[PDB]
């Protein structure tokens, strides 16, 4: 699937940057365009893979290149005031050549938290391709203000995209490590999962149709190196992905639609594993629709299974954020 990726804020920027590197290393053809938007000048300079002409500094009149800290209200205001700066950069993207936009951002801060939903709304207003969000939730160790920002940002972001894919840092914390060291490993985990998803063969239509019901999505993932053997290995990965740690933890029962993706060398893929996998996923989810296919990749030394679950509900983490936002209103 061909994406226009826009990273918003420091986290969104680093994730999109890594996505570009991943896509390039594997010749995956995923990141057709990459743009980074920030109010902190130093953050944009630190990027490695996003073209300098696609790094947009906004809010100069308000924060003079110094960021908005964790003031997401100000983040939303600068995104609204300076949306034409962002559009300036987007105008260089060959939009006719993309299947969808993806707006990537941490929700706990200020620039991305406030600006990502503003951008998503702007994009849906002028383009007709789907606009998805990838929202990254904060660690519970960061502090109450970051949780509150995320709660408020989530409420708005989910309403402005066609679907909000979620990755929760709190479920993926790396304990013994430095903050930045933790983010480097987390960003690898993020890109390996969504990179496999966006990479009979699964086409973009199947992804778009899986996401079309809107709301929140979560991704399961398992991988391993290296006819019954093939089938059983596949069904095992499917189980490991469904029961393993999700990008956003939740009960998978009640998901609206599911998509199974198997990626690997053709000789270690077959139809039977995928068909059994789809039935098993339906048993575990009760999903309305369960699609499944593969990404044949010659020369690959790993097989990876990804399950995309769209329209998940009764998610404790989401119910927490809603409660957090509601209390702060009152
Ligand atoms: N996965 C990931 N999350 C990050 C990273 N950096 C920051 N975060 C998370 O993103 C939130 C916003 O931080 P940041 O993007 O720097 O703030 P912003 O630039 O004001 O939007 C933080 O509260 C963290 O939860 C990163 O490199 N990777």
Swiss-Prot record:
Q: Name one Pfam family in it.
A: CetZ_C
Alphabetized UniProt keyword annotations: Cell shape, Cytoplasm, GTP-binding, Nucleotide-binding
Q: Name one GO molecular function term.
A: GTPase activity
* Amino acids binding GTP: 10-14, 110-112, 142, 169, 187
What PROSITE patterns is this protein classified in?
A: TUBULIN
Family matches, as PANTHER family: CELL DIVISION PROTEIN FTSZ-RELATED, TUBULIN-LIKE PROTEIN CETZ
Q: What is this protein called?
A: Tubulin-like protein CetZ1
Question: Can you name the source organism?
Answer: Haloferax volcanii (strain ATCC 29605 / DSM 3757 / JCM 8879 / NBRC 14742 / NCIMB 2012 / VKM B-1768 / DS2)
Q: Which gene encodes it?
A: cetZ1
């Amino acid at each position: 699937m061909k994406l226009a990726m826009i990273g918003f804020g420091q986290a969104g920027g680093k994730v999109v940057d890594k996505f570009v590197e991943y896509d390039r290393e594997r010749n995956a053809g995923i990141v057709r365009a990459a743009v980074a938007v920030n109010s902190a000048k130093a953050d944009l300079l630190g990027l490695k893979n996003i073209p300098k002409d696609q790094r947009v500094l906004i809010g100069q009149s308000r924060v003079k290149g110094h960021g908005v800290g964790a003031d997401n209200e100000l983040g939303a205001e600068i995104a609204e005031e300076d949306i034409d700066e962002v559009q300036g950069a987007i105008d260089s993207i060959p939009v006719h050549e993309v299947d969808a936009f993806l707006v990537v951002s941490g929700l706990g801060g200020g620039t991305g938290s406030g600006g990502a939903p503003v951008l998503a709304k702007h994009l849906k207003r002028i383009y007709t391709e789907p606009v998805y969000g990838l929202g990254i939730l904060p660690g519970s160790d960061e502090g109450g203000i970051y949780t509150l920002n995320a709660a408020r940002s989530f409420q708005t972001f989910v309403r402005e995209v066609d679907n909000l894919l979620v990755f929760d840092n709190d479920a993926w914390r790396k304990t013994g490590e430095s903050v930045q060291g933790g983010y480097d490993e987390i960003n690898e985990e993020i890109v390996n999962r969504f990179g496999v998803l966006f990479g009979s063969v699964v086409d973009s239509s199947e992804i778009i149709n899986t996401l079309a019901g809107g709301g929140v999505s979560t991704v399961g993932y398992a991988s391993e190196g290296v006819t019954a053997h093939t089938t059983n290995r596949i069904t095992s990965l499917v189980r490991k992905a469904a029961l393993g740690r999700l990008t956003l933890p939740c009960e998978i029962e009640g998901a609206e639609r599911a998509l199974l993706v198997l990626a690997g060398p053709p000789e270690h893929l077959n139809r039977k594993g995928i068909e059994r996998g789809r039935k098993w996923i339906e048993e575990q989810t009760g999903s309305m629709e369960v699609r499944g296919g593969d990404y044949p990749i010659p020369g690959a030394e790993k097989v990876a299974g990804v399950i995309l679950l769209s329209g998940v509900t009764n998610v404790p983490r989401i119910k927490e954020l809603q409660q957090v936002a509601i209390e702060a209103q009152d």
